[PDB]
Amino acid sequence: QVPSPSIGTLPPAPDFKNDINEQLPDKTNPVITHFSTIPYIMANDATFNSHQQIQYSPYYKLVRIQYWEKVTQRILGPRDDYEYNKTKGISKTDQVSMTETVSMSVGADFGFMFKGFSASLSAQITKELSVTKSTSTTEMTEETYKEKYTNPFNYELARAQYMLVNEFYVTRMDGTRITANWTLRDNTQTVTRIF
Amino acid sequence: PPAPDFKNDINEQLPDKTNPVITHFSTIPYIMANDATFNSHQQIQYSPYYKLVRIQYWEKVTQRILGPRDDYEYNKTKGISKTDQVSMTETVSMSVGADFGFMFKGFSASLSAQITKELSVTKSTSTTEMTEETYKEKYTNPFNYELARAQYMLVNEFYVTRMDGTRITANWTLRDNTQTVTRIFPKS
């Protein structure tokens, strides 16, 4: 039988458990949250030609994984500040792969850009993945930047921030990966934990 | 292999990426290789060492035909993504320093001399890991005639391999933005 990805529920970001010193997990367990079936004419397959797609993979699966990445964690002394690295967006290789395999890319607004034949299925695919159609005219980059936090209180405070990470990948009808996982770090979706 | 060029046609579209070639590899012991589908016994019996493999390929940074004296701005990428930095540390205990040398973490520091020698890479002296950055770069046609210009970047990719050749990682892409070749279409 044609396989079906197991859909999961993304749990809430890790939190503090009555401890100031508890190290919080760096990543949380990846959970398949969505997928969407696409015709073979949209999936340029590096090891499959037109003919064998038609008889062996007339459809492909576009899968969405989600998990929480720990952006940073730190204890701060009364009223102390500090800086940390924070990464947003999707890598350059990952955007070239997505555009070359399924004719898609991520725009500067975290939406999706649909190119070629892929444009006919935009409404289906944005719905089934629960992502939105981009209105941007430039592609998202990956950017690692510095972010400062100042402890506002006059007591010691642990603080950890988590970001929502997406991973996307395409798959033959029988389930064989034809790609690596394309990573998109959504910095508009962070959870902050203090104790 | 040589970077693509114009020969005698101004309008030629040049390749987006050359075909990747394997240029180096270094042998590493099973113990610094986190293999997700092998236990310690299977590694020792079936892949007592792994191959860290270095690949190279030219990537067209940009191509453009400019009218007389025309300028333009284009994208350009340096470095290595956070995911790729994170995978390399989880698999082989290494990452890329800010000076494009390799940082050896954990057991890997034992063999830094062997790996950098075998891979033809350098050991980083940096205290900071390389990131990935996309920035704009400007170019202006110096001539009062039409000019086609293409710039190529030499990209490095690294991946790990069981003794028998089985791929156990994605490709880790490193773009050193100072290793470039710049071709112009009327050369003289």
Residue numbers in the entry:
A (entry chain B): -3 to 191
B (entry chain A): 7 to 194
Pull text from the paper.
Cry78Aa is a novel protein identified from the Bt C9F1 strain that effectively kills rice planthoppers, with median lethal concentration (LC50) values against Laodelphax striatellus and Nilaparvata lugens of 6.89 and 15.78 μg ml−1, respectively. Here, we report the crystal structure of Cry78Aa, which consists of two domains: a C-terminal β-pore forming domain belonging to the aerolysin family and an N-terminal trefoil domain resembling the S-type ricin B lectin. We also found that Cry78Aa binds carbohydrates such as galactose derivatives and is essential for insecticidal activity against Laodelphax striatellus. Bioassays showed that the NTD or CTD of Cry78Aa alone has no toxicity against planthopper nymphs, indicating that its insecticidal activity is dependent on the cooperation of both domains.
After growing and optimizing the selenomethionine derivative crystal of Cry78Aa155-359, its structure was determined by the SAD method and refined to 2.4 Å resolution with Rwork and Rfree values of 0.198 and 0.249, respectively. Cry78Aa155-359 packed as a dimer in the crystal, and its two protomers were almost superimposed on each other. The structure of Cry78Aa155-359 represents the conformation of the CTD in the absence of the NTD and has a domain organization similar to that in Cry78Aa13-359. According to the structure of BinA/B, which has significant structural similarity with Cry78Aa, the CTD of Cry78Aa can be further divided into the sheet domain, TM domain and sandwich domain. Similar results were observed when testing the effects of the pore-forming domain Cry78Aa155-359 on the survival of the nymphs: nearly all the nymphs in the assay remained alive under the same conditions. Cry78Aa155-359 had an apparent MW of 23.7 kDa, which was in accordance with its monomeric state of Cry78Aa155-359 (23.7 kDa). However, Cry78Aa155-359 has several characteristic features of aerolysin-type pore-forming toxins. Sequence analysis showed that 20.5% of Cry78Aa155-359 consisted of either serine (7.8%) or threonine (12.7%).
